[PDB]
Amino acid sequence: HQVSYFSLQDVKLLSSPFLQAQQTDLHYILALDPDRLSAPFLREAGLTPKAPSYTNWENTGLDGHIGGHYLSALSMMYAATGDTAIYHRLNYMLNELHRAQQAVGTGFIGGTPGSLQLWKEIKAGDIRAGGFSLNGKWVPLYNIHKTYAGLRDAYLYAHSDLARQMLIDLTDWMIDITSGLSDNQMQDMLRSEHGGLNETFADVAEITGDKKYLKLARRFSHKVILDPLIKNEDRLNGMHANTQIPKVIGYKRVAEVSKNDKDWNHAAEWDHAARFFWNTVVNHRSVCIGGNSVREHFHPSDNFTSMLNDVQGPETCNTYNMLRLTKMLYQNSGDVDNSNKPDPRYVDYYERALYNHILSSQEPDKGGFVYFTPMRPGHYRVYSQPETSMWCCVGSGLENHTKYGEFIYAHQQDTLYVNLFIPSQLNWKEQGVTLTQETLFPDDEKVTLRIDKAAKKNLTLMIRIPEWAYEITINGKKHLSDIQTGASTYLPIRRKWKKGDMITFHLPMKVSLEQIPDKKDYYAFLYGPIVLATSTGTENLDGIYADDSRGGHIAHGRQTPLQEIPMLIGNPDSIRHSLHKLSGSKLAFSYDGNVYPTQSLELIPFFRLHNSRYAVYFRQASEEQFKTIQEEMATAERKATELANRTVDLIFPGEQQPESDHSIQYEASETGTHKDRHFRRAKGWFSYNLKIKEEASQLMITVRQEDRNKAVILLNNEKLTVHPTVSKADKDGFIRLCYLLPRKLKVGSCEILFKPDGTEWTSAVYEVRLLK
Ligand SMILES: OC[C@@H]1O[C@@H](O)[C@H](O)[C@H]1O
Ligand SMILES: [Zn+2]
């Protein structure tokens, strides 16, 4: 009673938003130049590139990482479509990386600048690990993971035997690199973000049937993250989120591949840790669109204030990764709970995240991937372009839209699970069945399953009845059936299905009003599983299509004060009831209640809302508390927005991407978190380059009041000797040091360096903000 999935070859998408997203991504993938993506690999192998690498992250230290994702996305797109242009690119990319691999002859393939020197040092036990760095390199373990993954996917999806041997050679190479390292050394190294290496090493174990790769997969499992999760402890506050999710996927994969390993007793524990991780992130750390994190990090689960105020809402990779995890947990959920039927609550999550975040994260006509999806009312999101943008979210973006076929159905001997209501044709070879699902969902409630071919075996269709949603029709005849539960469940329908049979059901959709999880005054409207949003305007959408600059993934355009965005006046039940469905064949709604300030509001599915500012979460105010809530918006929030709109450059020390984007250098430095803000400090020094788009007159530095450590500040190597203005401390003990610069910083770049000022350390610096 094992549940399994269908391959992408056996699930054809029919006309729908999902097929459109697939075709749009197909065009994006084919626009990339494989000579530019291969260039880093060929360079590190001592060969001559046929073209320059791409810029952005591909020439500032993550060189090679898109090439890995590119392999994965081509392979999956190929399995999904058979597209001949796709195969030309895959065959070329693989053969170029093969030449690279053969030129060095040890198994190594890699794009990180100075790769061979790096892995030489590591092998010798010269391990200098930070959060996002290893021996001066930018997350090289994460980088090389995308190659492992890509080669795995070329083998699994496109049947490449060449990819299979390249993968085995590359894995054997890592066994050699790590053979002289102790567990303490491995665990030290793993403090640097390493993607899901443990997952891929477990995949190689399964492909080869050789346990040495399972041993390797466990050695690459980061213990400081795993052990609390085994014990149902969420210690994720302050952690970089997309760093962790692949680790957890890997723990789960190691458990799967270890199911019948007589020499290791830990499979159930590792599975459980993955299951807890999922439960805790979904139930306490996720917003209505299915994603998590603010500025790439987990914020406290009892404080979503940053999620509603910061322009850097959920990162798309994180959701991509949660969906991968969801798929693994669902599959043996019936084994784990003893029912032998999989748990549809996983599918409720998959559906929410697929329609509302994944589908929303690609510009649907031209293409372009989203990195950050703000939940702040009245902001907008930025899209990648093929030749300019080399972000992680481009990489996972390429994969996302290749594989919408993967979770629509699942099969279990003589049972088919119908999980997603996505127009599709299924080839259920195992039971000689071909089936077509037709529906306009979510713009209509009706779903039809048609049997195109069958071999008259008795089969049970398990139709998902989501919590948000019994009369079915079979060949014109109604079969009424009684609700066993209000929870998410399956309706079984068993027949000797034959060609021409037709099953029709309806999914009743209702308006709901979902509060932000910490129960502050913010709510989002849904219709069935679809998050609605309103378009608040189309001005100041700066960089909506990104250039190749560092920080180009961020929507840096003017911030609108929250008091200029519609706030909903009244109590939640009245607000819910004031939303009314407009007629037409596409979902649209008008909000007929009191809105401050008045704009009536039209709401549409967030996944169709593009090239504009929006609100998903609306601020809400009771009639009684209106005066005090509006006054806070009109004074404190208004001033915070003034501050943002005066900011020329902004760095969050201790946060990897802001640091990387400003060319972090350091000696004898550490990072951490305190009162939910990140810091960096050093006994030596740490520096960044400020990007000065407009002339700046002030430098604002945030430190803790009670920190006795002091920093000297150098600006292009000149000591800043001006006396700062010192703010009053906030609730958490933080103060701002405002330096009025003797001369205005001129447009361009300028180094800022922090050194200890007599004390053992610099001050712990929690923010660097340059102001007009
Ligand atoms: O560090 C590599 C990737 O880029 C990051 O900033 C993402 O959040 C992370 O997983
Ligand atoms: Zn990303």
Short mmCIF file of N, CA, C and O in Angstrom, two decimals, residues 592-697:
data_model
loop_
_atom_site.label_atom_id
_atom_site.label_comp_id
_atom_site.label_asym_id
_atom_site.label_seq_id
_atom_site.Cartn_x
_atom_site.Cartn_y
_atom_site.Cartn_z
N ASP A 592 -17.39 46.35 -0.93
CA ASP A 592 -18.49 47.31 -0.78
C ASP A 592 -18.64 47.87 0.64
O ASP A 592 -19.73 48.23 1.05
N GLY A 593 -17.55 47.97 1.35
CA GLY A 593 -17.57 48.34 2.77
C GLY A 593 -16.77 49.61 2.88
O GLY A 593 -16.31 50.12 1.88
N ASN A 594 -16.60 50.09 4.10
CA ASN A 594 -15.91 51.34 4.32
C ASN A 594 -14.41 51.11 4.22
O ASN A 594 -13.85 50.24 4.88
N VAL A 595 -13.77 51.93 3.41
CA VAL A 595 -12.35 51.88 3.15
C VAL A 595 -11.79 53.27 3.46
O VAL A 595 -12.38 54.27 3.05
N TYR A 596 -10.67 53.34 4.19
CA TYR A 596 -9.97 54.61 4.44
C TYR A 596 -8.52 54.54 3.93
O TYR A 596 -7.78 53.69 4.39
N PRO A 597 -8.07 55.45 3.05
CA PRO A 597 -8.89 56.49 2.39
C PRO A 597 -9.62 55.88 1.22
O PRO A 597 -9.16 54.88 0.66
N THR A 598 -10.75 56.46 0.82
CA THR A 598 -11.55 55.94 -0.31
C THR A 598 -10.80 56.20 -1.63
O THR A 598 -10.26 57.27 -1.81
N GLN A 599 -10.75 55.21 -2.53
CA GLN A 599 -9.81 55.19 -3.68
C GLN A 599 -10.22 56.05 -4.89
O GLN A 599 -11.26 56.73 -4.89
N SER A 600 -14.74 52.49 -5.11
CA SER A 600 -14.76 51.10 -4.66
C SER A 600 -13.49 50.33 -5.04
O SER A 600 -12.80 50.69 -6.00
N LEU A 601 -13.20 49.27 -4.29
CA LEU A 601 -12.04 48.40 -4.54
C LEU A 601 -12.42 47.19 -5.36
O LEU A 601 -13.40 46.52 -5.02
N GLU A 602 -11.64 46.87 -6.38
CA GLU A 602 -11.77 45.63 -7.14
C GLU A 602 -10.60 44.68 -6.76
O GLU A 602 -9.42 45.09 -6.69
N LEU A 603 -10.93 43.42 -6.51
CA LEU A 603 -9.95 42.42 -6.12
C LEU A 603 -9.98 41.31 -7.15
O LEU A 603 -11.07 40.89 -7.59
N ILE A 604 -8.80 40.84 -7.51
CA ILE A 604 -8.62 39.75 -8.47
C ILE A 604 -7.62 38.76 -7.91
O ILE A 604 -6.92 39.07 -6.93
N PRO A 605 -7.50 37.59 -8.54
CA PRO A 605 -6.49 36.65 -8.05
C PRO A 605 -5.11 37.26 -8.08
O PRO A 605 -4.73 37.86 -9.11
N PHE A 606 -4.37 37.15 -6.97
CA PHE A 606 -3.01 37.68 -6.88
C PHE A 606 -2.11 37.11 -7.99
O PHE A 606 -1.24 37.82 -8.51
N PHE A 607 -2.35 35.88 -8.41
CA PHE A 607 -1.51 35.30 -9.48
C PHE A 607 -1.74 35.96 -10.83
O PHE A 607 -0.93 35.75 -11.70
N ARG A 608 -2.83 36.73 -11.01
CA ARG A 608 -2.99 37.55 -12.23
C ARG A 608 -2.64 39.02 -12.07
O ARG A 608 -2.84 39.80 -12.99
N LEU A 609 -2.11 39.40 -10.92
CA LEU A 609 -1.86 40.79 -10.65
C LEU A 609 -0.37 41.02 -10.90
O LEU A 609 0.48 40.52 -10.16
N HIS A 610 -0.07 41.75 -11.96
CA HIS A 610 1.32 41.96 -12.41
C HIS A 610 1.50 43.39 -12.84
O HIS A 610 0.52 44.05 -13.18
N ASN A 611 2.76 43.83 -12.85
CA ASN A 611 3.17 45.17 -13.31
C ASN A 611 2.39 46.26 -12.60
O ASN A 611 1.93 47.23 -13.22
N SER A 612 2.22 46.07 -11.29
CA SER A 612 1.61 47.11 -10.47
C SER A 612 1.82 46.88 -8.98
O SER A 612 2.22 45.79 -8.54
N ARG A 613 1.60 47.96 -8.22
CA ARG A 613 1.59 47.88 -6.78
C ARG A 613 0.30 47.16 -6.34
O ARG A 613 -0.68 47.16 -7.06
N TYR A 614 0.31 46.57 -5.15
CA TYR A 614 -0.81 45.77 -4.72
C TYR A 614 -0.89 45.69 -3.23
O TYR A 614 0.09 45.97 -2.52
N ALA A 615 -2.05 45.27 -2.76
CA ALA A 615 -2.19 44.79 -1.40
C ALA A 615 -2.84 43.41 -1.45
O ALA A 615 -3.79 43.19 -2.20
N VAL A 616 -2.28 42.51 -0.65
CA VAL A 616 -2.84 41.20 -0.36
C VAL A 616 -3.41 41.30 1.05
O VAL A 616 -4.61 41.18 1.23
N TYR A 617 -2.54 41.56 2.03
CA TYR A 617 -2.99 41.87 3.38
C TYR A 617 -3.41 43.33 3.40
O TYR A 617 -2.68 44.20 2.89
N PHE A 618 -4.59 43.58 3.97
CA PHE A 618 -5.06 44.93 4.24
C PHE A 618 -4.97 45.18 5.74
O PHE A 618 -5.35 44.34 6.55
N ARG A 619 -4.50 46.36 6.11
CA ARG A 619 -4.67 46.82 7.47
C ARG A 619 -6.18 46.95 7.76
O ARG A 619 -6.96 47.38 6.89
N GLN A 620 -6.56 46.60 8.97
CA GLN A 620 -7.93 46.64 9.44
C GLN A 620 -7.96 47.49 10.71
O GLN A 620 -6.98 47.54 11.44
N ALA A 621 -9.08 48.19 10.92
CA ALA A 621 -9.27 49.04 12.10
C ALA A 621 -10.71 48.93 12.55
O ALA A 621 -11.63 49.11 11.74
N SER A 622 -10.91 48.62 13.83
CA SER A 622 -12.23 48.68 14.42
C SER A 622 -12.72 50.15 14.42
O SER A 622 -11.91 51.10 14.52
N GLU A 623 -14.03 50.33 14.31
CA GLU A 623 -14.62 51.68 14.46
C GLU A 623 -14.15 52.38 15.76
O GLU A 623 -13.87 53.57 15.77
N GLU A 624 -14.03 51.60 16.82
CA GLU A 624 -13.70 52.10 18.15
C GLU A 624 -12.23 52.56 18.24
O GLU A 624 -11.92 53.57 18.85
N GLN A 625 -11.31 51.80 17.64
CA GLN A 625 -9.91 52.09 17.76
C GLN A 625 -9.38 52.91 16.58
O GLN A 625 -8.18 53.17 16.53
N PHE A 626 -10.25 53.34 15.66
CA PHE A 626 -9.86 54.06 14.45
C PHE A 626 -8.95 55.23 14.73
O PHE A 626 -7.94 55.40 14.05
N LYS A 627 -9.34 56.06 15.70
CA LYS A 627 -8.62 57.29 15.96
C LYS A 627 -7.15 57.03 16.34
O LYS A 627 -6.26 57.65 15.78
N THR A 628 -6.91 56.12 17.27
CA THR A 628 -5.57 55.82 17.70
C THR A 628 -4.76 55.08 16.61
O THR A 628 -3.59 55.38 16.43
N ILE A 629 -5.38 54.16 15.88
CA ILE A 629 -4.70 53.48 14.76
C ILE A 629 -4.31 54.44 13.62
O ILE A 629 -3.17 54.37 13.13
N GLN A 630 -5.22 55.34 13.21
CA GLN A 630 -4.90 56.30 12.14
C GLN A 630 -3.79 57.28 12.58
O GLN A 630 -2.91 57.61 11.80
N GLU A 631 -3.87 57.76 13.82
CA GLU A 631 -2.84 58.65 14.35
C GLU A 631 -1.44 57.99 14.35
O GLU A 631 -0.47 58.64 14.00
N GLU A 632 -1.33 56.72 14.72
CA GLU A 632 -0.05 55.99 14.61
C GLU A 632 0.46 55.94 13.16
O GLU A 632 1.65 56.15 12.89
N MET A 633 -0.46 55.69 12.22
CA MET A 633 -0.10 55.65 10.79
C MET A 633 0.33 57.02 10.31
O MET A 633 1.27 57.16 9.50
N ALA A 634 -0.36 58.06 10.80
CA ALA A 634 -0.16 59.43 10.31
C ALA A 634 1.11 60.07 10.85
O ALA A 634 1.53 61.08 10.31
N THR A 635 1.68 59.51 11.90
CA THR A 635 2.87 60.05 12.56
C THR A 635 4.01 59.01 12.48
O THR A 635 4.87 59.17 11.66
N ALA A 636 3.98 57.94 13.28
CA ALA A 636 5.12 57.01 13.34
C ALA A 636 5.38 56.26 12.02
O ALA A 636 6.51 56.24 11.53
N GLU A 637 4.35 55.62 11.44
CA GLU A 637 4.56 54.91 10.17
C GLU A 637 4.91 55.89 9.05
O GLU A 637 5.83 55.63 8.30
N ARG A 638 4.20 57.02 8.94
CA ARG A 638 4.60 58.07 8.00
C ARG A 638 6.09 58.47 8.12
O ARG A 638 6.77 58.58 7.10
N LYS A 639 6.58 58.70 9.34
CA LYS A 639 8.03 59.02 9.50
C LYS A 639 8.96 57.86 9.07
O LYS A 639 10.03 58.10 8.48
N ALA A 640 8.58 56.61 9.35
CA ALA A 640 9.41 55.46 8.94
C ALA A 640 9.51 55.39 7.42
O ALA A 640 10.57 55.06 6.89
N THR A 641 8.42 55.77 6.73
CA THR A 641 8.39 55.79 5.27
C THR A 641 9.24 56.96 4.73
O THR A 641 9.97 56.79 3.75
N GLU A 642 9.13 58.13 5.34
CA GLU A 642 10.07 59.25 5.08
C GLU A 642 11.52 58.85 5.22
O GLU A 642 12.30 59.17 4.35
N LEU A 643 11.86 58.13 6.29
CA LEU A 643 13.21 57.60 6.46
C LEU A 643 13.66 56.70 5.28
O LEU A 643 14.73 56.90 4.69
N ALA A 644 12.82 55.73 4.91
CA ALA A 644 13.08 54.84 3.78
C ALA A 644 13.30 55.61 2.48
O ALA A 644 14.23 55.30 1.72
N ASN A 645 12.44 56.60 2.23
CA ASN A 645 12.52 57.34 0.99
C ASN A 645 13.68 58.38 1.00
O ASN A 645 13.98 58.95 -0.05
N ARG A 646 14.27 58.66 2.17
CA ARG A 646 15.54 59.42 2.25
C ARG A 646 16.80 58.54 2.15
O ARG A 646 17.90 59.06 2.11
N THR A 647 16.64 57.23 2.09
CA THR A 647 17.79 56.32 2.17
C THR A 647 18.42 56.15 0.79
O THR A 647 17.74 55.84 -0.15
N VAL A 648 19.71 56.37 0.70
CA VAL A 648 20.47 56.19 -0.52
C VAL A 648 21.03 54.76 -0.59
O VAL A 648 21.09 54.18 -1.66
N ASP A 649 21.50 54.22 0.53
CA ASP A 649 21.97 52.83 0.58
C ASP A 649 21.74 52.29 1.99
O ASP A 649 21.63 53.05 2.97
N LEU A 650 21.62 50.98 2.07
CA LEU A 650 21.21 50.32 3.29
C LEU A 650 21.84 48.95 3.34
O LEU A 650 21.72 48.20 2.39
N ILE A 651 22.52 48.65 4.44
CA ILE A 651 23.13 47.34 4.66
C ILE A 651 22.65 46.77 5.99
O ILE A 651 22.61 47.49 7.00
N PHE A 652 22.29 45.48 6.00
CA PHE A 652 22.01 44.73 7.24
C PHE A 652 23.17 43.77 7.56
O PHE A 652 23.24 42.68 7.00
N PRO A 653 24.12 44.19 8.44
CA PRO A 653 25.24 43.32 8.81
C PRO A 653 24.77 42.04 9.46
O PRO A 653 23.79 42.03 10.18
N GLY A 654 25.50 40.97 9.20
CA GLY A 654 25.07 39.65 9.62
C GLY A 654 24.03 39.00 8.72
O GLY A 654 23.68 37.88 8.97
N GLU A 655 23.52 39.68 7.70
CA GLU A 655 22.56 39.06 6.76
C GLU A 655 23.31 38.83 5.45
O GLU A 655 23.85 39.78 4.87
N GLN A 656 23.40 37.57 5.03
CA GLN A 656 24.32 37.20 3.91
C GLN A 656 24.13 37.92 2.59
O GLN A 656 25.12 38.39 2.00
N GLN A 657 22.88 38.08 2.14
CA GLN A 657 22.70 38.71 0.84
C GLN A 657 23.00 40.21 0.80
O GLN A 657 23.72 40.67 -0.09
N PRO A 658 22.48 41.00 1.78
CA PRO A 658 22.91 42.42 1.84
C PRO A 658 24.43 42.58 1.93
O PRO A 658 24.99 43.49 1.31
N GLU A 659 25.07 41.71 2.71
CA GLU A 659 26.51 41.72 2.86
C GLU A 659 27.22 41.37 1.58
O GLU A 659 28.12 42.11 1.13
N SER A 660 26.78 40.30 0.94
CA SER A 660 27.35 39.91 -0.35
C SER A 660 27.14 41.00 -1.41
O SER A 660 28.05 41.32 -2.15
N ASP A 661 25.94 41.59 -1.45
CA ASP A 661 25.63 42.64 -2.40
C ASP A 661 26.47 43.90 -2.20
O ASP A 661 26.56 44.70 -3.13
N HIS A 662 27.04 44.11 -1.01
CA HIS A 662 27.91 45.28 -0.73
C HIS A 662 29.40 44.87 -0.54
O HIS A 662 30.17 45.60 0.11
N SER A 663 29.80 43.72 -1.09
CA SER A 663 31.22 43.30 -1.19
C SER A 663 31.91 43.22 0.19
O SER A 663 32.96 43.81 0.43
N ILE A 664 31.26 42.50 1.09
CA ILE A 664 31.73 42.30 2.45
C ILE A 664 33.15 41.76 2.39
O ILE A 664 33.45 40.87 1.59
N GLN A 665 34.03 42.36 3.20
CA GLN A 665 35.33 41.78 3.57
C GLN A 665 35.51 41.91 5.07
O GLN A 665 34.94 42.82 5.71
N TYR A 666 36.30 41.00 5.64
CA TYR A 666 36.53 41.01 7.07
C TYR A 666 37.72 40.18 7.51
O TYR A 666 38.21 39.33 6.78
N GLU A 667 38.13 40.42 8.74
CA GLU A 667 39.13 39.62 9.42
C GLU A 667 38.73 39.56 10.91
O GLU A 667 38.39 40.60 11.53
N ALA A 668 38.78 38.35 11.45
CA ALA A 668 38.41 38.04 12.85
C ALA A 668 37.06 38.68 13.21
O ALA A 668 36.98 39.59 14.03
N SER A 669 36.01 38.19 12.53
CA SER A 669 34.65 38.72 12.64
C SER A 669 33.67 37.61 12.97
O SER A 669 33.93 36.45 12.69
N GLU A 670 32.58 37.98 13.63
CA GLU A 670 31.47 37.08 13.86
C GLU A 670 30.16 37.81 13.60
O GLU A 670 30.11 39.03 13.54
N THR A 671 29.12 37.02 13.39
CA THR A 671 27.76 37.51 13.23
C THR A 671 26.90 36.84 14.28
O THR A 671 27.32 35.91 14.93
N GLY A 672 25.69 37.36 14.47
CA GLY A 672 24.71 36.75 15.36
C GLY A 672 23.39 37.51 15.29
O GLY A 672 23.18 38.35 14.40
N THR A 673 22.52 37.22 16.25
CA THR A 673 21.21 37.83 16.35
C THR A 673 21.02 38.21 17.80
O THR A 673 21.52 37.54 18.70
N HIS A 674 20.33 39.32 18.03
CA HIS A 674 20.00 39.74 19.36
C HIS A 674 18.76 40.58 19.24
O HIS A 674 18.70 41.47 18.37
N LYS A 675 17.77 40.30 20.08
CA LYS A 675 16.47 40.97 20.00
C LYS A 675 15.94 40.99 18.57
O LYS A 675 15.45 42.03 18.09
N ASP A 676 16.08 39.85 17.88
CA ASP A 676 15.60 39.67 16.49
C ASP A 676 16.30 40.49 15.38
O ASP A 676 15.92 40.38 14.24
N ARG A 677 17.34 41.27 15.68
CA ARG A 677 18.10 41.97 14.65
C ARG A 677 19.44 41.29 14.53
O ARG A 677 19.98 40.80 15.53
N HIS A 678 19.96 41.23 13.31
CA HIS A 678 21.29 40.67 13.06
C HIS A 678 22.40 41.73 13.25
O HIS A 678 22.16 42.93 13.09
N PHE A 679 23.60 41.26 13.58
CA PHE A 679 24.77 42.12 13.68
C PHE A 679 25.99 41.44 13.07
O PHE A 679 26.03 40.21 12.90
N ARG A 680 26.97 42.27 12.76
CA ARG A 680 28.34 41.86 12.60
C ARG A 680 29.22 42.68 13.57
O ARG A 680 28.90 43.85 13.90
N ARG A 681 30.30 42.06 14.05
CA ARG A 681 31.39 42.76 14.73
C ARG A 681 32.69 42.04 14.43
O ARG A 681 32.70 40.96 13.81
N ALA A 682 33.80 42.64 14.85
CA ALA A 682 35.11 42.07 14.57
C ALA A 682 36.16 42.55 15.57
O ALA A 682 36.03 43.63 16.14
N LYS A 683 37.16 41.69 15.78
CA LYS A 683 38.36 42.03 16.52
C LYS A 683 39.39 42.60 15.56
O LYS A 683 40.25 43.36 15.98
N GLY A 684 39.31 42.22 14.28
CA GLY A 684 40.14 42.78 13.24
C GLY A 684 39.43 43.97 12.62
O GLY A 684 39.64 45.12 13.01
N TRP A 685 38.57 43.68 11.64
CA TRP A 685 37.83 44.70 10.92
C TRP A 685 36.78 44.05 10.01
O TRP A 685 36.84 42.86 9.69
N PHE A 686 35.82 44.85 9.57
CA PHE A 686 34.93 44.45 8.48
C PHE A 686 34.57 45.66 7.66
O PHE A 686 34.49 46.76 8.19
N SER A 687 34.36 45.46 6.36
CA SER A 687 34.10 46.54 5.44
C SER A 687 33.03 46.18 4.41
O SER A 687 32.75 45.00 4.18
N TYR A 688 32.46 47.23 3.81
CA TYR A 688 31.57 47.13 2.66
C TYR A 688 31.85 48.27 1.68
O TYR A 688 32.52 49.26 2.03
N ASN A 689 31.33 48.14 0.46
CA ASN A 689 31.18 49.27 -0.49
C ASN A 689 29.77 49.83 -0.45
O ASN A 689 28.80 49.11 -0.66
N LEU A 690 29.63 51.09 -0.11
CA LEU A 690 28.37 51.77 -0.22
C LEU A 690 28.16 52.11 -1.70
O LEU A 690 29.12 52.58 -2.35
N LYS A 691 26.95 51.84 -2.21
CA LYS A 691 26.51 52.23 -3.55
C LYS A 691 25.73 53.54 -3.41
O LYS A 691 24.67 53.57 -2.82
N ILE A 692 26.29 54.62 -3.96
CA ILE A 692 25.79 56.00 -3.78
C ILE A 692 25.15 56.46 -5.10
O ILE A 692 25.82 57.00 -5.99
N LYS A 693 23.85 56.23 -5.23
CA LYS A 693 23.08 56.60 -6.42
C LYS A 693 22.83 58.11 -6.49
O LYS A 693 22.88 58.70 -7.55
N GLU A 694 22.55 58.72 -5.34
CA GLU A 694 22.40 60.17 -5.17
C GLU A 694 23.36 60.62 -4.07
O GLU A 694 23.69 59.85 -3.18
N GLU A 695 23.76 61.88 -4.10
CA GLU A 695 24.65 62.41 -3.04
C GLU A 695 24.09 62.19 -1.64
O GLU A 695 22.93 62.43 -1.40
N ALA A 696 24.92 61.72 -0.71
CA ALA A 696 24.49 61.46 0.66
C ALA A 696 25.15 62.43 1.65
O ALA A 696 26.35 62.67 1.56
N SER A 697 24.37 62.94 2.61
CA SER A 697 24.88 63.85 3.64
C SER A 697 24.98 63.24 5.03
O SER A 697 25.61 63.85 5.89
#
